[PDB]
Enzyme design. Structure first.
Site, PDB file in Angstrom:
ATOM      1  N   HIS A 137     -36.983  83.137 -18.129  1.00  0.00           N
ATOM      2  CA  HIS A 137     -37.099  82.545 -18.931  1.00  0.00           C
ATOM      3  C   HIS A 137     -36.352  81.575 -19.448  1.00  0.00           C
ATOM      4  O   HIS A 137     -36.149  80.477 -20.365  1.00  0.00           O
ATOM      5  CB  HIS A 137     -37.293  83.171 -20.491  1.00  0.00           C
ATOM      6  CG  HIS A 137     -39.111  84.296 -20.359  1.00  0.00           C
ATOM      7  ND1 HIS A 137     -40.019  83.951 -20.197  1.00  0.00           N
ATOM      8  CD2 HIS A 137     -38.846  85.873 -20.040  1.00  0.00           C
ATOM      9  CE1 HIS A 137     -40.769  84.723 -19.970  1.00  0.00           C
ATOM     10  NE2 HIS A 137     -40.371  86.011 -19.569  1.00  0.00           N
ATOM     11  N   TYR A 307     -40.683  97.663 -17.689  1.00  0.00           N
ATOM     12  CA  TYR A 307     -39.673  98.146 -18.889  1.00  0.00           C
ATOM     13  C   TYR A 307     -40.306  99.970 -18.769  1.00  0.00           C
ATOM     14  O   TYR A 307     -40.573 100.534 -20.626  1.00  0.00           O
ATOM     15  CB  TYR A 307     -39.969  97.838 -20.376  1.00  0.00           C
ATOM     16  CG  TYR A 307     -39.415  96.331 -20.380  1.00  0.00           C
ATOM     17  CD1 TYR A 307     -38.479  95.932 -20.678  1.00  0.00           C
ATOM     18  CD2 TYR A 307     -40.349  95.533 -20.450  1.00  0.00           C
ATOM     19  CE1 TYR A 307     -37.712  94.786 -19.778  1.00  0.00           C
ATOM     20  CE2 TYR A 307     -39.972  94.103 -18.883  1.00  0.00           C
ATOM     21  CZ  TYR A 307     -38.634  93.632 -20.038  1.00  0.00           C
ATOM     22  OH  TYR A 307     -38.158  92.794 -19.794  1.00  0.00           O
TER      23      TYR A 307
HETATM   24  N1  LIG Z   1     -42.326  92.231 -27.637  1.00  0.00           N
HETATM   25  C1  LIG Z   1     -41.167  91.152 -26.579  1.00  0.00           C
HETATM   26  C2  LIG Z   1     -41.599  90.316 -26.208  1.00  0.00           C
HETATM   27  C3  LIG Z   1     -41.211  89.868 -24.843  1.00  0.00           C
HETATM   28  C4  LIG Z   1     -40.139  88.926 -25.822  1.00  0.00           C
HETATM   29  C5  LIG Z   1     -39.649  87.895 -24.545  1.00  0.00           C
HETATM   30  C6  LIG Z   1     -39.253  88.346 -23.191  1.00  0.00           C
HETATM   31  C7  LIG Z   1     -40.370  89.202 -23.048  1.00  0.00           C
HETATM   32  C8  LIG Z   1     -39.853  90.050 -21.727  1.00  0.00           C
HETATM   33  O1  LIG Z   1     -40.729  91.178 -21.013  1.00  0.00           O
HETATM   34  C9  LIG Z   1     -38.869  89.322 -20.404  1.00  0.00           C
HETATM   35  S1  LIG Z   1     -39.452  89.187 -19.064  1.00  0.00           S
HETATM   36  C10 LIG Z   1     -40.074  90.365 -23.597  1.00  0.00           C
HETATM   37 ZN   LIG Z   2     -41.961  90.025 -18.186  1.00  0.00          ZN
END
Ligand SMILES: NCCc1cccc(C(=O)CS)c1
Ligand SMILES: [Zn+2]
Ligand SMILES: [K+]
Ligand SMILES: [K+]
Length: 613
Positions: A137, A307
Site C-alpha cells: 500500500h 489477520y
Molecule cells: N479495517 C481496516 C482496513 C484496512 C486499512 C488499511 C490496510 C488494511 C490491510 O489489511 C493492509 S493489507 C486494512
Molecule cells: Zn490486506
C-alpha cells in the site's frame, strides 16, 4: 541447478506495536509473525528451509521507490514520543508509527532484497520472506495501509537494476489492492502487475476508482496492470481458481516472466475478519503450484496481509509446503464461479482483450521402469522398480489367463507387473508419489493400469492421452475422464471426454490453461494416467497436472525416446521447467466450441456470466 527454499525471518520485526486506541489498525499486531513462524516449526517446515539472515536496506535502495522528503520524514520517527508519533500517524490514512518501526521497515525491505539475491544467484530455487511492516500500500511519498515502505516494488526495481531483468511478474493475492505497486509500475511494461481485491463497487478500502478493471496501465505500460475486483464477499476456491485459469495464468505464461514476486496477503483466506472470503488455506498451495513453471521456478513469496491468528499459520504452511515440492492437497467441491465473479472476470477479459489476444470474443517420490536392458542416471530422488513380487506375478497370471490371454511375451508381462507394482506403491503406500513406465502393447498396458487403479481403490481417474486411435477406456460411467490430444478432428460427442485437434505450442498451452486444468480441478481425480503413443510442452503439462490426485501420476510411454523419458522423469521428480517464451484462429474456434459444449457440466470453464432462457 539451484535447490532448496529460502525462509527469511527475524524476531526483531515482531518488536513494534500500536501504542494508542485505533480500531482501524488494531488487527495489525506483532503476534502475526510469531504465529506464522511457530506454525512452520510445528509441521517441520522452517527446518527444511535455508534460513537467510535479514539485513537493513540501504538508503539508495530505499530511494529506488521513495523520495528524499518522505525518507527523511520517516527517519525522524525513532526520536518521537507517543504524542508526536500519534500526530505523525494522523497525517496518513490507516497507519501507525512506532520508535522501532523505521528499523523494522528497513529490515522488511532488506529481507525482501536478501530473498531476491538468494533466488537470482541460484543459491535457492525459491523463497519466502516473513516480514513486517507490509508494503503493497505504501507509495513514493506516503505511508498507507499499515505499510511504511513498499517491499515488493523494492524487489522488482532491485532485480531490474542488479540483474538486467526485462520481465517481472507480480501477483497480489491480498484482498486489498496494491495501489503503491500499481502506481510504481503503471507506465512500466517491464513489471506486469496482477491484483485481485475486495472492491464492493468502490465502497471498500482504499475506495479508489482506479482499483477497478478499467485501470489497464497508462502510456507504454497499457496492458501490464490487471485489477480483478470482487464486488461480493464470500468468494470461494472456485472463484480464485477461475480467476487464475481464465485471467492470470494465460497472461502470465504469454508474458513469460523472468522472475515471479508474490504479495502473500492471506487475508483472502476464510476466517479473516478483514477480507471475509471463503477460500481455504489449502488453495494457496495451488496458487503457488500453478505459478511454479514460470521463471524456471524462481519465486519470491513476500508476506503482506492476514489477520486471523488461527488460520494465518495454515495458509503460510500451505504456501511453504508447495514451495518445498510437497504434494498439494486434493481440492474437492469445486464448481462454477458465482455470477459476481463471472462478471468481474468477463469485464477484465474484455477490457484487456485489446492487449492480450486470447481474451477476444466473437460478437523417494518417482519410480522409473526403463526398457529392459537400459541404464540412465535417475535424479537423486528417483529409483527403479524393485523387481516384482509373488502376489504381483500371481495377479499378472490371473489377468492374462482371464482376459487377453494368447500372450507369452515376457517383456509385455513384465511391463504389466511393473505397472501393478508402481500402482501399489503409489496409492497403497506413502512412499512413491508418481511414476513412469515404458510399455509395449498399448491396449494391454492401458487396460491393466486403469482396471488395477480402479480397484486400488481410485474414486476417479483422469486419463491424458496423446495420440490417435481409440484407446480401451470407457467414459460412460462417472469414474473416468479422458483428455485426448490427437491429430484427426474426430468429434465432440459425450461429456466425459475432451478431444483436441507450428504455433501448436501456444494453442496447446492455452487449451491446457483454459480447458484441461479447469475440468481436471473440478473432476478432482484420485490418479492421473498419462499415455503417449509413438512433445516440447509435455514438461509444463506434467508439472501443472500434478496439482491433481495429491501428486499421484502414472505415465506410460510407448517409445524408448531418451529425451522424452528424461523430461517426464524430471517433471515428475519436481525439477525446474525451462520456460517457453499466437495460436491459430481455427484452434481458438475449436477451443471455444469445446468450452460451449462442456461448460454446462463443468462450471469451471465459464468465463462469462450465463444468460437464462
Ligand atoms: N479495517 C481496516 C482496513 C484496512 C486499512 C488499511 C490496510 C488494511 C490491510 O489489511 C493492509 S493489507 C486494512
Ligand atoms: Zn490486506
Ligand atoms: K491484491
Ligand atoms: K505495470
Amino acid at each position: 541447478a539451484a535447490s532448496g527454499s529460502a525462509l527469511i525471518f527475524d524476531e526483531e520485526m515482531s518488536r513494534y506495536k500500536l501504542l494508542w486506541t485505533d480500531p482501524e489498525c488494531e488487527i495489525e499486531v506483532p503476534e502475526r509473525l510469531t504465529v506464522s513462524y511457530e506454525a512452520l516449526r510445528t509441521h517441520g517446515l522452517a527446518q527444511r528451509c535455508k534460513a537467510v539472515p535479514v539485513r537493513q536496506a540501504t538508503e539508495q535502495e530505499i530511494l529506488l521507490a521513495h523520495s528524499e522528503e518522505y525518507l527523511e520524514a520517516v527517519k525522524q520517527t525513532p526520536g518521537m514520543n507517543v504524542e508526536e508519533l500519534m500526530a505523525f500517524s494522523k497525517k496518513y490514512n490507516a497507519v501507525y508509527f512506532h520508535q522501532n518501526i523505521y528499523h523494522c521497515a528497513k529490515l522488511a525491505a532488506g529481507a525482501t532484497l536478501q530473498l531476491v539475491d538468494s533466488v537470482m544467484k541460484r543459491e535457492v530455487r525459491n523463497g519466502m520472506a516473513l516480514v513486517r511492516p507490509p508494503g503493497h500500500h505504501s507509495q513514493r511519498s506516503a505511508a498507507n495501509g499499515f505499510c511504511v515502505f513498499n517491499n515488493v516494488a523494492f524487489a522488482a526495481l532491485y532485480a531490474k537494476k542488479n540483474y538486467n531483468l526485462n520481465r517481472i511478474l507480480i501477483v497480489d493475492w491480498d484482498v486489498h489492492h496494491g495501489q503503491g505497486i500499481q502506481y510504481c509500475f503503471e507506465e512500466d511494461p517491464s513489471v506486469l502487475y496482477f491484483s485481485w481485491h475486495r472492491y464492493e463497487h468502490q465502497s471498500f478500502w482504499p475506495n479508489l476508482p482506479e482499483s477497478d478493471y478499467s485501470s489497464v496501465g497508462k502510456g507504454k505500460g497499457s496492458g501490464f496492470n490487471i485489477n480483478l475486483p470482487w464486488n461480493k464477499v464470500g468468494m470461494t476456491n472456485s472463484d480464485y481458481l477461475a480467476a487464475f485459469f481464465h485471467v492470470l495464468l494465460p497472461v502470465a505464461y504469454e508474458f513469460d516472466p523472468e522472475l515471479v514476486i508474490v504479495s502473500a496477503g492471506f487475508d483472502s483466506a476464510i476466517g479473516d475478519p478483514e477480507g471475509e472470503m471463503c477460500a481455504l488455506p489449502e488453495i494457496f498451495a495451488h496458487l503457488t503450484h500453478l505459478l511454479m513453471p514460470l521463471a524456471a521456478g524462481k519465486m519470491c513469496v513476500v508476506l503482506e496481509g492476514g489477520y486471523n491468528l488461527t488460520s494465518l499459520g495454515q495458509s503460510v504452511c500451505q504456501t511453504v509446503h508447495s514451495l518445498l515440492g510437497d504434494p498439494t492437497p486434493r481440492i474437492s467441491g469445486l464448481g462454477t464461479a458465482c455470477d459476481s465473479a463471472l462478471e468481474s472476470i468477463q469485464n477484465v477479459r474484455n477490457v484487456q482483450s485489446s492487449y492480450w489476444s486470447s481474451f477476444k470474443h466473437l460478437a523417494v517420490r518417482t519410480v522409473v521402469v526403463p526398457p529392459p536392458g537400459v541404464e540412465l542416471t535417475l535424479p537423486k530422488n528417483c529409483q527403479h522398480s524393485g523387481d516384482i513380487s509373488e502376489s504381483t506375478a500371481k495377479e499378472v497370471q490371473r489377468i492374462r489367463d482371464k482376459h487377453f490371454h494368447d500372450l507369452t511375451d515376457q517383456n509385455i508381462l513384465r511391463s504389466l507387473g511393473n505397472i501393478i507394482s508402481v500402482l501399489d506403491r503409489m496409492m497403497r503406500s506413502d512412499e512413491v508419489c508418481n511414476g513412469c513406465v515404458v510399455v509395449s502393447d498399448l491396449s494391454v498396458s492401458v487396460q491393466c493400469a486403469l482396471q488395477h487403479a480402479l480397484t486400488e481403490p481410485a474414486e476417479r481417474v483422469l486419463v491424458v492421452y496423446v495420440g490417435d486411435g481409440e484407446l480401451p477406456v470407457k467414459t460412460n460411467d462417472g469414474k473416468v475422464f479422458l483428455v485426448q490430444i490427437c491429430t484427426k478432428e474426430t468429434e465432440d460427442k459425450c461429456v466425459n471426454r475432451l478431444t483436441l485437434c507450428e504455433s501448436l505450442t501456444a494453442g496447446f498451452m492455452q487449451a491446457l490453461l483454459g480447458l484441461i486444468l479447469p475440468v481436471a480441478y473440478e473432476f478432482n481425480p484420485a490418479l492421473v494416467l498419462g499415455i503417449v503413443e509413438e512433445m516440447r510442452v509435455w514438461g509444463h503439462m506434467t508439472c501443472l497436472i500434478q496439482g491433481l490426485a495429491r501428486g499421484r501420476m502414472l505415465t506410460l510411454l510407448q517409445g524408448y525416446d531418451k529425451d522424452l523419458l528424461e523430461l517426464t522423469v524430471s517433471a515428475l521428480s519436481g525439477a525446474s521447467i525451462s520456460p517457453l517464451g499466437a495460436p491459430k484462429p481455427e484452434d481458438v474456434e475449436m477451443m471455444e466450441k469445446q468450452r460451449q459444449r462442456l461448460q454446462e457440466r463443468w462450471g469451471l470453464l465459464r468465463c462469462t456470466v450465463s444468460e437464462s432462457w
